[PDB]
Amino acid sequence: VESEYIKKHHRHELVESQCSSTLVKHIKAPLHLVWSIVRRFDEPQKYKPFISRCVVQGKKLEVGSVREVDLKSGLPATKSTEVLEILDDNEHILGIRIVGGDHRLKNYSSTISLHSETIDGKTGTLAIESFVVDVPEGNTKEETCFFVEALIQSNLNSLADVTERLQAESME
C-alpha cells in the first residue's frame, strides 16, 4: 500500500539532487602515525583496499594535485579521477573531490579529519569522514548513502587495521 502506491504513481526522477552523510571510526594508534598515512594523497593504496593502482602526474602532494586511480574488480566502477582540495597539516584535515571516472558519483567531494581520543586507557585517534554527492538517476537518497557508507566504512576499517599493525611493529 502506502509505499507501493507511491512507487507506482509518485516516482519522479529529479533533474538533480545531492545527499550527504558522515562516518566515524576509532583507531588504536597515535594521531601522528594515522596522519602520516592519511596525508599521502599520492598513495591511497597504503590503506584503501580497493585501489589496484594510483598515478599522480606532476606535483604529487599539494592543493590541485590530481590522482588517477584504477580499482580492483568487483565494484560498479573501474577508475576514478580525484583532485586534492584540502591538505591541512595544522588541523589534520584532508579534502578531496572526484572529477572523473566511470562511477556514478557525480559532484562527489569528501572530508576526513583526525582527532585525538583516549579509550580504555590507551591513546588513539578518532577518524571522521563525511561526503556530499549527487544522487544518480534511478536511485534514492538513502540508497546512495548505503553504497557510499559501505565504501567509506571499508576504507576506515582498513585505515584502522594498517595503522594499528604499524603501531604494533613500532612498539617492538
Partner: protein, 328 residues
C-alpha cells in the same frame, strides 16, 4: 558397465590477465585426484553392488584482490577430499535414505564453509611445510572470490557453485548450464538478503549494498551475512550425447552466451582431430589435451576480440571417449 570403464581426463586451460590492471583470477585442475564412493553415484533404479576415480576442476573469479581466489586454488580441492573421506567413512558404517543430490550437498557445503572459515581466521589451518596450525585471516575483509567446481567421473558430473562464475555442459546440440548464477535479483536471494537486514540496490546491476553483483561467494566478510559462502550443487548423470564441459569466470560469459561458447568449443575440438593424429594413448590424461587447449585458446582470443575488459579463465573438458571420422 559404465562404473567399470577407464575415465581418461581430457582438458585444456587458459587463465590470463587480459585488459585488466591486475590478475584476480585463479584455477586448479587435479586429474585422478579423488576416490568417489560408488554409493554416492549409483542411482536407485540401478542394481546394487568400490569407488570411481574422480577428476577435479575449479575456477575462482576473485574480487577485491587476488588472495582469496589463490587460497581456493591452493586449498579447496584438498578440503573437499577431506570432506569426502569423512562422509565415506560414515556411509560405510551407517546408511540413511539420503538421496545422492543431498549427499553431495552436505559434502560441498561443509567444504566451502571450511575454506571460508580458514580465510576469515576462524578455523585452524595447516601451512605447507609446517607441523603447526595457525588461526589467522588469509586476506582482508574486502577480498572474496566466486568458486565453480566440477568433479567428473565415468558416470557423473557433479558441479558445486558459489557466485556468478558458471559451468556449462554441451549435450547433443544444446547448452545446459550446470549452475545457476547467485545474483541478488533472484527472488530467493533478494528475500534472504532483505530479511537479514541488508539492501539490494540497483547500481550498474542489482548489487548487495550497491557494491557486489553476486549474492554468494567465498570470503567477503565485510558483507556477511548478506553474501554467504554456501554453494548449490548439481548432480548430473552423463550421457553418450555429451560433447564437452566448460568452466569459466565472467571474463568469458559477459561477452558470449552459453550456446555460442559450447558450439565454438566443440567445433575447435573437432577441427583439431581432423588435422591431427590421435595422441599417444599412454601419455593421454597426464597433462593438457591439445584439442581442448586449442578450444580454450580460441575462446579467450574471441572474448578479447569482443571487448572483454576482464580477467579471462576457461577450462575446456572433452567428454567424448574418442573422435573418429568414418568415411568412404
Amino acid at each position: 558397465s559404465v562404473y567399470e570403464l577407464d575415465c581418461i581426463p581430457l582438458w585444456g586451460t587458459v587463465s590470463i590477465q587480459g585488459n585488466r590492471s591486475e590478475m584476480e583470477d585463479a584455477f586448479a585442475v587435479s586429474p585422478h585426484f579423488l576416490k568417489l564412493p560408488i554409493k554416492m553415484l549409483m542411482g536407485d533404479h540401478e542394481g546394487m553392488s568400490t569407488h570411481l576415480t574422480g577428476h577435479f576442476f575449479g575456477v575462482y573469479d576473485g574480487h577485491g584482490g587476488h588472495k582469496v581466489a589463490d587460497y581456493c586454488r591452493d586449498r579447496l580441492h584438498f578440503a573437499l577430499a577431506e570432506e569426502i573421506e569423512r562422509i565415506k567413512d560414515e556411509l560405510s558404517k551407517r546408511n540413511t535414505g539420503e538421496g545422492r543430490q543431498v549427499q553431495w550437498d552436505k559434502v560441498f557445503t561443509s567444504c566451502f564453509l571450511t575454506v571460508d572459515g580458514e580465510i576469515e581466521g576462524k578455523i585452524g589451518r595447516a601451512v605447507v611445510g609446517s607441523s603447526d596450525k595457525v588461526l589467522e585471516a588469509v586476506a582482508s575483509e574486502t577480498v572474496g572470490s566466486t568458486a565453480v567446481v566440477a568433479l567428473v567421473c565415468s558416470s557423473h558430473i557433479v558441479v558445486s557453485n558459489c557466485g556468478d562464475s558458471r559451468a556449462v555442459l554441451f549435450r547433443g546440440k544444446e547448452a545446459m548450464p550446470l549452475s545457476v548464477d547467485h545474483k541478488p535479483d533472484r527472488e530467493d536471494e533478494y528475500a534472504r538478503i532483505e530479511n537479514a537486514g541488508g539492501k539490494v540496490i540497483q547500481w550498474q546491476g542489482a548489487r548487495v549494498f550497491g557494491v557486489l553483483a553476486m549474492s554468494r561467494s567465498i570470503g567477503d566478510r565485510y558483507l556477511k551475512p548478506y553474501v554467504i559462502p554456501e554453494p548449490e550443487v548439481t548432480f548430473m548423470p552423463r550421457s553418450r550425447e555429451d560433447e564437452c564441459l566448460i568452466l569459466a569466470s565472467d571474463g568469458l560469459w559477459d561477452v558470449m552466451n552459453n550456446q555460442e561458447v559450447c558450439e565454438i568449443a566443440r567445433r575447435r575440438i573437432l577441427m583439431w582431430h581432423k588435422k591431427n593424429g590421435a595422441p599417444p594413448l599412454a601419455e593421454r590424461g597426464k597433462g593438457i589435451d591439445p584439442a581442448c587447449q586449442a578450444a580454450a585458446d580460441y575462446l579467450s582470443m574471441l572474448a578479447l576480440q569482443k571487448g572483454s575488459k576482464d580477467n579471462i579463465s576457461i577450462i575446456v573438458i572433452d567428454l567424448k571417449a574418442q573422435r573418429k571420422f568414418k568415411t568412404r
